């Protein structure tokens, strides 16, 4: 189906403990494929997925040089942002950026993304038109004016419609046996007595990729949204993800409950029930 490339940048100041740390990670869908960390003994863009290792030295040199330039620019930005908010030099602050592109099954651009946050609060974002910005406050308006003067949006549009989509298509082909393989969830229902009166039914989904999934409990065919405990989808460490959904049911009523599972790896959506 559809696919995405994303880069995630985090810069963190730490007054009295050196210059701000800069970390960058790159993802295709739910698969990390590169990392950079300015605190590494020899900072350099490093592979994190087997299909990126075939890129030659020119690739790693370029990506490392971009990361080191970004490290310096983000240190400058953190100094500027401290001033825009009249903040003390004594505090630690965070600047985050996430950008990239979404493509459809035919490889055509669906849309581009470029968004930034300061201390966890949305700061400035490129609009979907890839030509204008939305600034959160009067500080972000300073950044917007600087980027408008330098025609930053036109550079981002060129990148997102060009290199971003071209390289995403390249990665998708080089990694097609994993990036273009949906692994369906392995599913089962467990039963956990609580008391004489109630038991927990827990619907499990294990070993699936990508992370996108829908797990729902129905009682007599009605969704139990408010009554379902749904844990956050979590990584297993082997590419795949795990999730479960639980409902508390009166003893003897277990067969009125059904678990419903949707995932792109499944040939058809699943309906499960407790099978004692």
């Amino acid at each position: 189906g559809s696919h995405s490339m994303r880069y995630f940048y985090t810069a963190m100041s730490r007054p009295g403990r050196g210059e701000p740390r800069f970390i960058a990670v790159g993802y295709v869908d739910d698969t990390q494929f590169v990392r950079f960390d300015s605190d590494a003994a020899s900072p350099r863009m490093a592979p994190r997925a087997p299909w990126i290792e075939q890129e030659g030295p020119e690739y790693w040199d370029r990506e490392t040089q971009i990361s080191k330039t970004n490290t310096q620019t983000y240190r400058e930005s953190l100094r500027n942002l401290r001033g825009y908010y009249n903040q003390s030099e004594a505090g630690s602050h965070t600047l985050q950026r996430m950008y990239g592109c979404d493509v459809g099954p035919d490889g055509r651009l669906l849309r581009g993304h470029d968004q930034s946050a300061y201390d966890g609060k949305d700061y400035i974002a490129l609009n979907e038109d890839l030509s204008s910005w939305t600034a959160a406050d009067t500080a972000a308006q300073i950044t917007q004016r600087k980027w408008e003067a330098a025609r930053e949006a036109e550079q981002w549009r060129a990148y997102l419609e060009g290199l971003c989509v071209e390289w995403l298509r390249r990665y998708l082909e080089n990694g097609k046996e994993t990036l273009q393989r949906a692994d369906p969830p392995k599913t089962h229902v467990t039963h956990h007595p609580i008391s004489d009166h109630e038991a927990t039914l827990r619907c499990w989904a294990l070993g699936f990729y990508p992370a996108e999934i829908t797990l729902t409990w129905q009682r007599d065919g009605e969704d139990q949204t408010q009554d379902t405990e749904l844990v956050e989808t979590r990584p297993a460490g082997d590419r795949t993800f795990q999730k479960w959904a639980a409902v508390v049911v009166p003893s003897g009523e277990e067969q009125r409950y059904t678990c419903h599972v949707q995932h792109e790896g499944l040939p058809k959506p699943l309906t499960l029930r407790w099978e004692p």
Binding site: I66, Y74, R97, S116, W147, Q155
Partner: peptide
């Protein structure tokens, strides 16, 4: 493939 980010905030 990353973008080169040269304009500070």
């Amino acid at each position: 493939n990353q973008k080169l980010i040269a304009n500070a905030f």
